[PDB]
Structures are given as structure tokens and as C-alpha cells.
Amino acid sequence: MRAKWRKKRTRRLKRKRRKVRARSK
Amino acid sequence: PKRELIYKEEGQEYAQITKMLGNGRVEASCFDGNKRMAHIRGKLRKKVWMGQGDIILVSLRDFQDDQCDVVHKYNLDEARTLKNQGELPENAKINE
Amino acid sequence: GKGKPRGLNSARKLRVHRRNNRWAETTYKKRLLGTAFKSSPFGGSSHAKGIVLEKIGIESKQPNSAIRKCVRVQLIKNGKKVTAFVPNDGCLNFVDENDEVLLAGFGRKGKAKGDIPGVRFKVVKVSGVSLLALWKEKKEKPRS
Amino acid sequence: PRAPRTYSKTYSTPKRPYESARLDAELKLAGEYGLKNKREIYRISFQLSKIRRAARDLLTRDEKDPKRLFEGNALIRRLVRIGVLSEDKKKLDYVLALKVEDFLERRLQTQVYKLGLAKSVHHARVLISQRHIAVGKQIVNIPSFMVRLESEKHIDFARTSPFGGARPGRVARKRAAAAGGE
Amino acid sequence: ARAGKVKSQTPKVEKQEKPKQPKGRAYKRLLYTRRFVNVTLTNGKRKMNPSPS
Amino acid sequence: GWVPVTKLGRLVKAGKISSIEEIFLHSLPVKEFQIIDQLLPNLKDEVMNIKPVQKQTRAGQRTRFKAVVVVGDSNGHVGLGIKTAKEVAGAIRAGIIIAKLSVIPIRRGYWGTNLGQPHSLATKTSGKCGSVSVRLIPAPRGSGIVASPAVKKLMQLAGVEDVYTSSTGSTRTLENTLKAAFVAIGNTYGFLTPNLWEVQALTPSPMDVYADYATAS
RNA sequence: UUCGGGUCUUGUAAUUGGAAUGAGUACAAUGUAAAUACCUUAACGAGGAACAACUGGAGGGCAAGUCUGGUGCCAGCAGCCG
RNA sequence: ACCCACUCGGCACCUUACGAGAAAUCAAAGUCUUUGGGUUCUGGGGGGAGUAUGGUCGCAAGGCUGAAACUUAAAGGAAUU
Ligand SMILES: [Mg+2]
Ligand SMILES: [Mg+2]
Ligand SMILES: [Mg+2]
Ligand SMILES: [Mg+2]
Ligand SMILES: [Mg+2]
């Protein structure tokens, strides 16, 4: 697996997490 | 030229393949009643190859019930012979 | 001259640098953070007694094939559910269910041994008789 | 809580278990002088090692000056007294050399077999164990006794015990008693 | 039984009635005799424990 | 059978060179094997290890046998031969030959003060081959060979009694370690001591003296 | 000339002999603050079955088995390689 | 404006290695077991993971810092067939 792609996916996951946190707040 | 079947002993019990989980672990349905998470023994990963559902012999462990070990594979002819004998209820079907 | 001030009044920088560097070495880190007390089932002890909850034959790692005759053990002191392997020729004929069992490490400074996946400990003293003794019949089980 | 009694794990292993040649050599040594355990050879080596360490310590510091002259001299004296060191060699560099073979050939173990008495090293050992052999009139049952050269001229059979004229000997006595009734 | 078949299947052969392998210094002596005195028959490279053939 | 090629071989056969010290003095090539055997009859030759060595083909592989051979005495001459042949015994023989050709001197020296006979090295001196640095270090009397097995054996062959070694780099590739050790030993005869400021004569070589007996008739 | 005596020295074998013992038990005596134990010692103590040495190993690392039976990718081993 | 001989400063390059380096290669990656010119900073088997949490600096996307639990005998380099 490409490293760049992995990083992108991680970023997406992070974003999702942030969104979830916001919702919780 | 044709092969011959090996009959069960005690604890070692006939069963059917229901679903392919993976890795060498197959969720098999035993005709005793309960469904089990079975392991394909080393000799069988070599040549023995299953499909969507076949008839098997499975050694059921002395200390665990839900996990067990697939010892032997049965063919269509073998299955029919078993049915004739009366070890299994008449529901086992072979089609590919 | 490479890194380190080969200086003379240099020493604090050197010492601090060493301190900072050390943390990347695993053993030292473990000692300092105190990984022994917070984690790794045993209390940083050699042996721990636990209780035979359920006997499980764990299906071994690759090239090798077999079932590995381990025990899910709930430790008394921490209350952690480990899987302790049991040595030699069955000897679950000694272990049974709901027994007190003394466990050891495996030789691998924690971690995993040989080919058994998700396993960390040997069993030694079952009920207070030691597995080896039971197996070689040098001493025998206290009835029930 | 009076004081701690000072121990010393003296007699010390080699840093690898099995280098075949080493093992063979040690076995040969044991065979030569009849040693119950590798420990004995190891013991001797450790003692020699201590001496060697001391010698090394002395040597690095320039001789003609005090500690080297004095301590070194004392060490030399000690070694000549034990008999291990030879009177030819009183230079400290000679001390630095040496062998286990020098020490083993100076125990009361062999000083029996050299002076005759039993003849065969194992026999000598047996004799020493069985309260035959005194160094003075003080009886010795230490195989690795290390005979102090000037008291070597006194390794004779015990004042008590058979072989050295005292009594028949507890089996001989029994036989005599048996004979008596006939 | 899956739990320890080859221990509860293999035939029992007892330890034979033997003369004592003489302990202490004696064993060492014996070893010495075997290895550096009597000497096992020369071929080139020596063997401590030969299989009979 | 003997039969010499090269001038030096011929000279040796005539028996006008007594010992290899003279040869060493004039740094003479010894391409002919027999010479060393003739001059040093005291050669104790040891095999180290014979790792199989592979080469890949369309079908199967080529298993050659790289055998490390040491050669020595107690006098301070050591050989090192590496050979890779298909037949193992043959390979060993070849290695032996190579080692004999190689054979090199050692400036055995004093630990600290002269006393009696040199069984150490002169100087802390090192080699490095591949990435294995064998350092050796003049140990004092009786303090033995302090070395890993291979190196220890080499030292024994040399006729060194006392040596510390700092073997560093991946010493587990035995061949490389051995080579490094050999290099270090060679180096001994390079470190100009003050025992060496003294001006030499520079002798005319055996090649330039016994010239008429040399060369084919 | 075909040996041989085994003249000189070595080991090995359930064989068979006479000699040593302390570990044991133990009279006293010491030892002790009484007493144990040691150090002395009367008498009694050894004939492989006795007065009985284990622990771990023998693919390699690393000394030591391409022995003899069973198991047959199972049991199980193996600190890694296996 | 060329031309020839220099000469500092640079951007590089070509041969040799007498040195390195594991090697590929390098006039520096040299002057390092014969180890010491002065200094910053960074690394400690691979995964987990540039993750989680906490700080922070961002209008956000994010950045700087940054774990461990687990988990595995390899993951790597540079050459060769
Ligand atoms: Mg054993
Ligand atoms: Mg075992
Ligand atoms: Mg075995
Ligand atoms: Mg070995
Ligand atoms: Mg890391």
C-alpha cells in the first residue's frame, strides 16, 4: 500500500473523529 | 480404482460444512444439534478441497465444545452411502 | 568532530543529551515509565497464581501445525484473563477446571513463545504440585 | 547484628560452558591429580588469577618505588613458601606467567604420591580422607591442602591409624576376633 | 485422546538392573581412562558415543 | 616429484637459502608452493570451517566449498588460505597450499620489560576486512589468548601465548574475521618502534647473489 | 623360513580375595549457662541386592546418537533456527 | 573582443586511489581501534504509528510536539548468481 494513500485515509479518519467530537459537544 | 471411507469412533462425529470463514477455520454444523467453529487439520490443507457445503468427520475436543477439528472429508458417493446406512438425517445434498 | 561537544565545560549538555537519548532504548524506558506495574498481566513478578477458568486448545502459528492445549487463566492479584500454556504430553488430565494454578513466564521477556499465538505464560505448579512432577510421577496429585 | 560474617564465593566458572579443547584439558588435569570436581581446577585457577591480578597491579606502577617493591616482594615470598614458585624465579614477571599445573602439583593430594606412601593419586586421596597422613602431627584430611615446602619434609603416616603402626584396623580387628573363637 | 495420546499409548520399558556408575572422583577417573589413556580406536576424528555397526 | 619453476624455487632446491627470514628480508614472491614446505618443516595446518557456497542456474544450484585454512608453527609464521572448490578434501588441500604460499612473520614482543622470550605482540595493532576490525593488544605474561575461537586458533598457530583482542564488526562471518586478524598480524611488521631507528645495511638479494645457480640451463 | 614365549608394559569382564574407612549408631568425656552438634574415641560399622546421586541435555548454536522400540504435520518438542 | 600564462572566488566535471566505505561509490562520505579541531540537531529491530491523548499555533483543512498497550524474527541496505 502507498504511504501517501495511507496518510490520506488517516487524515480522513481524524476528520471523522473531529466531527464526532463536535457532535458530542 | 476407488477409495474407501473410515467410520467414526467416539467423540469423533460426522458433520456438514455450512460457511467458509477463512484461514483454515470453517464454521461447521454438526448433526448432533449445535453449530461449531472447526479447524482444518494439517493433512487436509494439502490436497483436500471443499465447496459450498460437504460432509465431514470432525473430532470434537475433550475440553472445548464450540471449537473442534475436521479430521476427514467425504465425497458425494460416500455421503450417499452414509445416508443409506442411517447415520445422518436425509437432507445432505451435493451440487456444483 | 561529530555531535557531542568534545568540549570541557560542556558537560551539562552531554548529560542532558544522554538522558534524552536513553528513552529510545526499550528496557530503560520500561524500567522508568513503570510498564511493569501498570501493564503486562503479572505485577512485574516472576510467578503468579491464577485460576483455571477454561481450557482452550489454541491452534498454532504457521509452518507448524497442532493444537496447543492452553488455559485461559484469571489471575488473582490483578484480575486479568491471560492464556497460560501447559507443557508436555496432555497434562490437562492434571489441570481440570476451576483449579488454582501457578504460572511462570516463558523465556521471552514477556512477548510470545515459539509458535503459540496470543500466549505468554507456562503453567508450573497446578494446585501446588508442579506439572513436571505430576507428569514424571515423582510426586502425585492431592486427590481433588 | 553483631557484624556480618564475610563470605567469598571464591571458586569461579569460565565465561563459556563448552569449548571442547578447554574441557578436554581440564579433564586431563583432573585425571592427572585425581580431582572430585571441576571446581577444584576452577578453584586453583581462581587463586592463581587473584595472584596474577595482584602482579599486574604491581607491574604497571614503576618498580624501584614503594608498593610494587614491598607488596610484590611479599607476594613472591608467599609463593616460594607454598612451593609453587621456584627459587630460580623471584622477579614478579615469572609470577605473572605460571599455570594451574604448578599449583595442583603442590597440594597434599600429590605430595603423598610424590613421597610414595600410597602410590596412585586416587589412592593418596583415599588415604588423606581416611585420617592417615599428617603434615606435622596435625592430621590432614584436605586433599587441596597445599604443602608449604618447609613442612613437606614431614608428610609421614599418622601417629594413629594402620599403615603407620597403631592398631589392626577395624576390619583386621574383626577378623582377629573371628579367628579367636576357633 | 487428544490430550496426551503418545504418553498413554507407548509401551512401558523399565530401567534395566545395572551395576552402579561409580560416582565422585571415580566417574572422572573412568572418563579419563576412556578419553586420554586407553583411547578409542584411531580413524582420524574421534567419537565419544559410537553407534554399533 | 619436485621440479622448480621460478628462480627462487631453483635456488631453494640448490640449498643456498637456509631459512625464510632471509626471503622475508627482501620481500620475495613465493608463487611456488614447495618452498615453504622445504624451509619450514614445522608447519601445523588447521582447517577452520567449510561453508557450502551456492550459485544459481536454470536447473538446481552449484554447491562449492569455501574452506578457511590456517597454517603455522610456534615460531611466528602464519598462513591463511581461502579456497572454493567443488570437492571438499581437494578444496582443503588447495587452501593449505595457498596458506603455505602466503605465510607471514610476526614481530612477537614484550608485554612490558624483556625478561625471557617474546610471546606477545609489539604494539596495539589492528586490521579491518569487509567490516570486521580485529584489534589486538599486547597482553602480559600468562594472561593467555583472549580471543574468539577462530582468532584464538590463529594466535596459537602463530606462537603467541598472550594477546587481548577487540574484535568488532560482524565477526560471525568467520572468513572475514580471519582475514582481518591476518592483516593485523601483517601490520605488526610495519609499526616503526624506536628499536627500529637504527640504520640497516640493505643486503643484496639472494636473487642478485646466487644468480648463476638460478635460471634454467 | 609359518608360528611363537608374552618374555617388557596396558586396559577390560556378573567373576573371586584380603586391606582401609566415616556416614551411621553411639559408654564416658568434653564442649555448655544448662543441654544438643563439632573435635577427640571405647565396643558396634560395606560385599553391587549394598552405606543405592542427581539434575539437565545428545540437529545446530554447544559437549554429547544419521542407536533400539512406538507416534505418524497427530500427539508433543523447540530460549531462536526449527 | 579574442589568445597564452597565471591567479583568487564559485558551479560542476574526468581520471586515478596511494585513503574511505558494508558495498554502490566518495578528493570527500578522506586525515577513525594509529579512535580527541569547534559546535547544532536527529536515530536506536520492524509493525502498531506520525496513530491515541494532552498541550499548543491555525477562521478551518491542519502543523509542531508525540505515547503506550499490544504485536512479530525479521523489516531493511548494497551488491551477486
Ligand atoms: Mg538423565
Ligand atoms: Mg526431555
Ligand atoms: Mg533421547
Ligand atoms: Mg556438537
Ligand atoms: Mg523504533
TrEMBL record, chain C:
Keywords: Hydroxylation, Ribonucleoprotein, Ribosomal protein
Gene Ontology cellular-component annotations: small ribosomal subunit
Gene Ontology MF terms: structural constituent of ribosome
Superkingdom of source: Eukaryota
Gene Ontology biological process terms in this record: translation
Gene3D superfamilies per the UniProt record, alphabetical: Nucleic acid-binding proteins
Entries under PROSITE patterns matching the protein: RIBOSOMAL_S12
PANTHER family the UniProt entry points to: 30S RIBOSOMAL PROTEIN S12 FAMILY MEMBER (PTHR11652)
Entry's family note: Belongs to the universal ribosomal protein uS12 family.
This protein's name: KLLA0B11231p
UniProtKB/TrEMBL annotation, chain D:
Recorded GO MF terms: rRNA binding; structural constituent of ribosome
Gene Ontology terms: cellular component: cytosolic small ribosomal subunit; small-subunit processome
PROSITE patterns: RIBOSOMAL_S4, S4
InterPro entries noted in UniProt: Ribosomal_uS4, Ribosomal_uS4_CS, Ribosomal_uS4_euk/arc, Ribosomal_uS4_N, S4_RNA-bd, S4_RNA-bd_sf
Domain Small ribosomal subunit protein uS4 N-terminal: 5-105
Region (Disordered): 164-182
KW S-adenosyl-L-methionine (keyword) present: no
Cell division keyword on record: no
Boundaries of every RNA-binding S4 domain copy: 106-170
Keywords tagged on the record: Ribonucleoprotein, Ribosomal protein, RNA-binding, rRNA-binding
Alphabetized CDD domains for the sequence: S4
Function: Component of the ribosome, a large ribonucleoprotein complex responsible for the synthesis of proteins in the cell. The small ribosomal subunit (SSU) binds messenger RNAs (mRNAs) and translates the encoded message by selecting cognate aminoacyl-transfer RNA (tRNA) molecules. The large subunit (LSU) contains the ribosomal catalytic site termed the peptidyl transferase center (PTC), which catalyzes the formation of peptide bonds, thereby polymerizing the amino acids delivered by tRNAs into a polypeptide chain.
Protein family (similarity comment): Belongs to the universal ribosomal protein uS4 family.
UniProt-recorded name of the protein: RP21
From TrEMBL, chain E:
Biological processes annotated in GO: translation
UniProt entry tagged with the keyword Ribosomal protein: yes
Keywords: Ribonucleoprotein, Ribosomal protein
One CC-aspect GO term: cytosolic small ribosomal subunit
One MF term in the entry's GO annotations: structural constituent of ribosome
Superkingdom to which the source organism belongs: Eukaryota
Keyword Ligase annotated: no
Region annotation (Disordered) ranges: 1-27
Recorded family membership: Belongs to the eukaryotic ribosomal protein eS30 family.
Name of the molecule in the record: 40S ribosomal protein S30
Upper classification of the organism: Eukaryota, Fungi, Dikarya, Ascomycota, Saccharomycotina
Residues of the full protein shown: 9 to 61 of 63
Automatic annotation (TrEMBL), chain F:
List of residues binding Mg(2+): L80
Keyword Metal-binding tagged: yes
Lineage top rank: taxon: Eukaryota
UniProt keywords, alphabetically: Metal-binding, Ribonucleoprotein, Ribosomal protein
Ranges of residues in domain S5 DRBM: 43-106
The keyword ATP-binding belongs to this UniProt entry's keyword annotation: no
Protein's GO biological process: translation
One Gene Ontology MF term: RNA binding
GO cellular component terms, semicolon-separated: cytosolic small ribosomal subunit
Transmembrane segments: none
Family: Belongs to the universal ribosomal protein uS5 family.
Protein's name according to its UniProt entry: Small ribosomal subunit protein uS5
Organism: Kluyveromyces lactis (strain ATCC 8585 / CBS 2359 / DSM 70799 / NBRC 1267 / NRRL Y-1140 / WM37)
